């Protein structure tokens, strides 16, 4: 009664040792506000600065320490790379969007890169402007979403290089981010007109829209939760960063609205469906704040904040399959400095050294539920769940 019932009220962040970091990495200098980093249990992908065109550095997780300046990179784009996203169903497939108005899908060798990679597997050319948004389908296999600066959202079939759907007359201004829902049947997007839109891609219709979700003119984000709600980070009229929770069945007023501070930089939300914990990481900030989303009011509970002395240029989150379960680790964040990638370990303090069933429920596995052909027909399936107990040592 005195203390709100929670398991993550004492989660603390702890950066890894110096020898476990990645140094001498020329991180990208693009003003586009993206994560600049994508990490799977196998490789680490960081967008890097190239003299000509664009490239991103893909290196194995075991390759820590100082990185050679002549290390091979994935340099195939003729323009700077904006977004990178690993395939959830294939640890060696990554899609990258660049300023050359194209989307390329790459195949990474098992042991890494020995020579520079220039020829991709599939080149997607459907955008007339730069593509800064990429999101793989959580369930359907080889289904990729790309949203360029032409205010056009495209659904691609990576296997057949086919454009499944085209959504043009749905965003009047610049699109900030696009996030799929749990099953993959819907996706939410934040636009420059301060409007949150829930759109069905297979039907091309607007499900729900909230105009002026955040009154500020600064960039804002919108992501989908596991239970089916929308968590948005934005700014107020007084240039104060806010967090909001929206019900897709009732958007007249937000369920929650909390103000964090008055600093600049867009807030990038990192959602963990297993723990229902949202990690808010602002660009240029030196702190990581995590909040728990529950049904009890005010539906947004501040847990704690990890504080550092160096601002972050980007940040990627390791999925559940790559975490160290035996050490009660629930999240790992690869914080990007200007010349270094510093992993940060989020650990739930527990006296017992055994496997914690409550901390690790069943998580989505690397096996696709449906296929591209099946998903187009209208089939909906939940992600296949695996057990994290086998990872205990």
């Amino acid at each position: 009664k005195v203390v709100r019932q929670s398991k993550f009220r004492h989660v603390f962040g702890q950066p890894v040792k110096n020898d476990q970091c990645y140094e001498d990495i020329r991180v990208s200098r693009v003003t586009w506000d993206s994560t600049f980093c994508a990490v799977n249990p196998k490789f680490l992908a960081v967008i890097v600065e190239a003299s000509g065109g664009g490239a991103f550095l893909v290196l194995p997780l075991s390759k820590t320490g100082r990185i050679d300046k002549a290390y091979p990179t994935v340099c195939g784009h003729t323009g700077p790379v904006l977004d990178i996203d690993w395939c959830p169903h294939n640890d060696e497939v990554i899609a990258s969007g660049s300023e050359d108005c194209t989307v390329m899908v790459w195949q990474i060798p098992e042991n890494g890169l020995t020579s520079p990679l220039t020829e991709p597997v599939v080149v997607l050319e459907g955008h007339t402007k730069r593509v800064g948004i990429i999101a793989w389908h959580p369930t359907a296999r080889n289904v990729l979403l790309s949203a360029g600066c032409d205010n056009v959202v495209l659904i691609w079939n990576v296997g057949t290089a086919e454009e499944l759907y085209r959504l043009d007359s749905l965003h009047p201004d610049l699109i900030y981010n696009v996030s799929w829902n749990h099953n993959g049947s819907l996706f939410c997007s934040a636009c420059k007109d301060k409007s949150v839109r829930i759109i069905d891609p297979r039907r091309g219709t607007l499900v729900a829209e909230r105009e002026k979700a955040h009154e500020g003119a600064r960039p804002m984000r919108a992501i989908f939760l596991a239970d089916g709600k929308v968590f948005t980070t934005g700014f107020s009229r007084m240039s104060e960063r806010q967090l909001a929770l929206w019900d897709p069945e009732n958007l007249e007023e937000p369920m929650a609205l909390q103000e964090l501070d008055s600093s600049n930089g867009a807030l990038l939300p990192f959602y963990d469906p297993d723990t229902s914990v949202v990690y808010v990481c602002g660009k240029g900030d030196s702190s990581i704040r995590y909040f728990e989303i529950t049904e009890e009011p005010p539906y947004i509970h501040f847990l704690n904040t990890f504080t550092s002395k160096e601002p972050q240029r980007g940040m990627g989150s390791m999925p559940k399959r790559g975490l160290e379960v035996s050490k009660c680790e629930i999240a790992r964040f690869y914080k990007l400095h200007e010349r270094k990638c510093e992993p940060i370990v989020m650990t739930v303090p527990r006296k017992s050294d055994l496997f914690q069933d409550d901390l690790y429920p069943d998580t989505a596995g690397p096996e696709a539920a449906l296929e591209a052909e099946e998903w187009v027909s209208g089939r909906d399936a939940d992600p296949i769940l695996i057990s994290l107990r086998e990872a205990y040592v």
Partner: protein, 366 residues
């Protein structure tokens, strides 16, 4: 209804969050009989031990801020919840106070006792010096907390503490009480037993004061009877003391009276300020806050201002803040803190402690 417990070396103040003054203030003593019973309770804690001290041997479970006996320590806490506050400890969250630079082992035992013996639903530990700054409504200042066991100087700037500049002086009210006993023998009065120590402590709290100029006051007392005062013993005898009124508190500013090599409270405060950054010393000079019962002598604030001014540069404004309630500043600041809506995130649940241990208490605490 959260509980605020400020347990010191000499006195224990307890009460409820939101109140203006502690509801239960009793000496932190445990008395045991030293004679044999001839007519047809083996320990007394607090005021009941003070009313029967003639047949008891009084012992302080805390000496110089160090708990010398944890069995007697639990008696003080048990007497607080059940006999003084008359509440169930398992139904109220408890806010506790700790000395600056408190050892983690001391905090672990205090946390373990509250959660395992008294089964408190929630518990938090706060720094006494920080709480003293809460009561004065300040975020910047250096707190000279002089209690019964030890004296501490904690500089705080804009809500940020400077542990490297925290200085400790092993000289407090109990050391002054023993010094008064020693110098009262020179006048012909012999106090030796532990029961008579409380009598001398009452004399110190009622007749002692700090002289602005010690040498002038000594000359005045040697040529006049104006400074003379009388005290009535519990058995009806009246004792009379002269220069001992200001000689006993003078050991605070001249520790050499006790054979100590350390410097006085005025120099300890000045040295703590000098250990801070240069850009923050100006704010610490004008925000010197006095806390604790030992700082309750009449004229101690004027002497503190005069001594520090002679040490600080002439261009600095020395301001000594001595609120009339500073004897309970630590508890009042804790009551204010425990009532803040933004403090509810700092509570540590009993269920969280069981599954996590004392590691979550070292974090969330400073």
């Amino acid at each position: 209804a959260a509980l605020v417990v400020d347990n010191g070396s000499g006195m224990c103040k307890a009460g409820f969050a939101g109140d203006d003054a502690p509801r239960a203030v009793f000496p932190s003593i445990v008395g045991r009989p030293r004679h044999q019973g001839v007519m047809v309770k083996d320990s007394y804690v607090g005021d009941e031990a003070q009313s029967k001290r003639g047949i008891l041997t009084l012992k302080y479970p805390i000496e110089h801020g160090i708990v010398t006996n944890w069995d007697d320590m639990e008696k003080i806490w048990h007497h607080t919840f059940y006999n003084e506050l008359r509440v169930a400890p398992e139904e109220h969250p408890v806010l506790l106070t700790e000395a600056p630079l408190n050892p983690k082992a001391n905090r672990e035992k205090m946390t373990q006792i509250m959660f395992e013996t008294f089964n408190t639903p929630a518990m938090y530990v706060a720094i006494q010096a920080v709480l003293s700054l809460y009561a004065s409504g300040r975020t910047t200042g250096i707190v000279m907390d002089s209690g019964d066991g030890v004296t501490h100087t904690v500089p705080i700037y804009e809500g940020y503490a400077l542990p490297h500049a925290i200085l400790r002086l092993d000289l407090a009210g109990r050391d002054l009480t023993d010094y008064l006993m020693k110098i009262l023998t020179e006048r012909g009065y012999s106090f030796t037993t532990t029961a008579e120590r409380e009598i001398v402590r009452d004399i110190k709290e009622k007749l002692c004061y700090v002289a602005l100029d010690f040498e002038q006051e000594m000359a005045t007392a040697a040529s006049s009877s104006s400074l003379e005062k009388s005290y009535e013993l519990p058995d009806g005898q009246v004792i009379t003391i002269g220069n001992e009124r200001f000689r006993c508190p003078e050991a605070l500013f001249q520790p050499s009276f006790l054979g100590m090599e350390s410097a006085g409270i005025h120099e300890t405060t000045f040295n703590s300020i000098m250990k801070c950054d240069v850009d923050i010393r100006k704010d610490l000079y004008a925000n010197t806050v006095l806390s604790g019962g030992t700082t309750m002598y009449p004229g101690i604030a004027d002497r503190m201002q005069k001594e520090i001014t002679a040490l600080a540069p002439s261009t600095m404004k020395i301001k000594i803040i001595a609120p009339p309630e500073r004897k309970y500043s630590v508890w009042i600041g804790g009551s204010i803190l425990a009532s803040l809506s933004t403090f509810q995130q700092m509570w540590i649940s009993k269920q969280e402690y069981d599954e996590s241990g004392p590691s979550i208490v070292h974090r969330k605490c400073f």
